[PDB]
Amino acid sequence: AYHIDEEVGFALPNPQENLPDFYNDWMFIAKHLPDLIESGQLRERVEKLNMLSIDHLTDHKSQRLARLVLGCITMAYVWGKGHGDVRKVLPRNIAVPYCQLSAALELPPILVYADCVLANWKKKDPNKPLTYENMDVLFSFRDGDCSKGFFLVSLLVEIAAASAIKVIPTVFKAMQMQERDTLLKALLEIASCLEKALQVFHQIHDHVNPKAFFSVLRIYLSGWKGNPQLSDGLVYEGFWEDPKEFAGGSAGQSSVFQCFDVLLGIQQTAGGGHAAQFLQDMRRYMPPAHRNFLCSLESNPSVREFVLSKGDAGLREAYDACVKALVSLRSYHLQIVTKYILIPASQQGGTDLMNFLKTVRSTTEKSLLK
Numbered sequence: 001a002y003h004i005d006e007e008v009g010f011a012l013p014n015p016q017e018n019l020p021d022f023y024n025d026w027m028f029i030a031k032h033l034p035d036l037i038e039s040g041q042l043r044e045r046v047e048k049l050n051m052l053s054i055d056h057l058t059d060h061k062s063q064r065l066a067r068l069v070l071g072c073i074t075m076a077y078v079w080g081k082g083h084g085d086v087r088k089v090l091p092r093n094i095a096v097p098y099c100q101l102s103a104a105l106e107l108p109p110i111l112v113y114a115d116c117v118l119a120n121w122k123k124k125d126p127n128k129p130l131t132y133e134n135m136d137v138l139f140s141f142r143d144g145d146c147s148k149g150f151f152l153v154s155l156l157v158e159i160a161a162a163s164a165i166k167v168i169p170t171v172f173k174a175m176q177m178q179e180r181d182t183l184l185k186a187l188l189e190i191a192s193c194l195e196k197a198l199q200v201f202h203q204i205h206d207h208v209n210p211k212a213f214f215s216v217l218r219i220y221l222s223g224w225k226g227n228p229q230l231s232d233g234l235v236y237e238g239f240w241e242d243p244k245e246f247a248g249g250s251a252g253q254s255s256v257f258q259c260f261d262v263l264l265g266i267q268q269t270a271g272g273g274h275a276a277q278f279l280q281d282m283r284r285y286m287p288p289a290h291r292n293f294l295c296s297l298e299s300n301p302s303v304r305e306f307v308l309s310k311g312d313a314g315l316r317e318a319y320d321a322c323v324k325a326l327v328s329l330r331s332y333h334l335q336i337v338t339k340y341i342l343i344p345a346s347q348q349g350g351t352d353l354m355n356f357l358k359t360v361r362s363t364t365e366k367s368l369l370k
């Protein structure tokens, strides 16, 4: 209804793995980035490409796949080996069809979370369920970059939150119909589903190691919105005349935390800059059906006001359980950022990044009712 799945939520159900034979030249380069980058040939291959019309991408999953391919080539081309030797101009034969496909999908021409997590996965055996050991990513950047661990655990955290988003309708039917036990059961189910997502987030440490992420994988996830290396943005040759700035693909582009902010009345959604607006800016990097889900959610009556006006220590307790699960997620997430960003940057905090994350948690903490 809003491109949300029952089993995988904001994730794309069974992504396409193949593009039509017309696009083999893209697929070949995208599937061999680790070789081509290491050998210092990637840029030469990109420049030798021909302009390939997007006209033969006629279904959504194949356009999704084509954006993942083009997004990964774009990251590799711009940054190269990550040795500070950057390219400031995306060649015309890639930039035009990429920008055209991105306009059709209503996404910025940069690699986003919906590309490299939500659409970048396959089941090893389809008859066996969605667990790490039975899944693989579709593209990677450098050997030992831990893209498989980072992407798949993100996805598995995404899939765990999915089992909460399917209760969200029932929360609202229950409020409407003055249905006290249902609403209390429903909020409990959400809190327990947010709790299972926190368990799943623990799998990060045995599939990603801090140095691979911080010094290899992070390079190719970096964008050009306020980045000293491309002080002015990127030139999408033959599509726009002046450079453009787009944010690098943080997992901050996930809709999961915002979905439950909006549902719980937590005013991250609104507020003061350097915080509420970064979360608003980050909405522009999410698929359009998902942008709409978040907006429709706000239009709904407040759950926090409903629960507040009922003198019901039961409803207040279940609502607080959901608030408390959210606070744990961001707290654990603060741990994750320390190990995978701060200590490695510290070994050759110092960035307000932590004040952003901490601010967001404190807001979540101050929404507790009782």
Ligand code: HEM
Residues within 6 Å of the ligand: 150, 153, 154, 157, 158, 201, 204, 250, 251, 252, 253, 254, 256, 257, 258, 330, 333, 336, 337, 340, 341, 353, 357, 360
């Ligand atoms: C595993 C290593 C991870 C690192 C190093 C990391 C890093 C970051 C950073 C740096 C930000 C702030 C945005 C920015 O400045 O780029 C952020 C925010 C965020 N991250 Fe991640 N992240 C990781 C994993 C995850 C995972 C698995 C999720 C699962 C949903 C997630 C969800 C979010 C969300 C929702 C935000 C927005 C801030 C908020 O709503 O609290 N992150 N993260």
Ligand SMILES: N[C@@H](CC(=O)c1ccccc1NC=O)C(=O)O
Residues within 6 Å of the ligand: 036, 037, 038, 039, 040, 041, 042, 043, 044, 079, 080, 081, 082, 083, 084, 085, 086
């Ligand atoms: N080490 C440099 C150059 C480089 O890595 C590179 C990688 C793939 C294809 C071409 C490259 N540079 C010049 O042709 C860099 O950081 O981009």
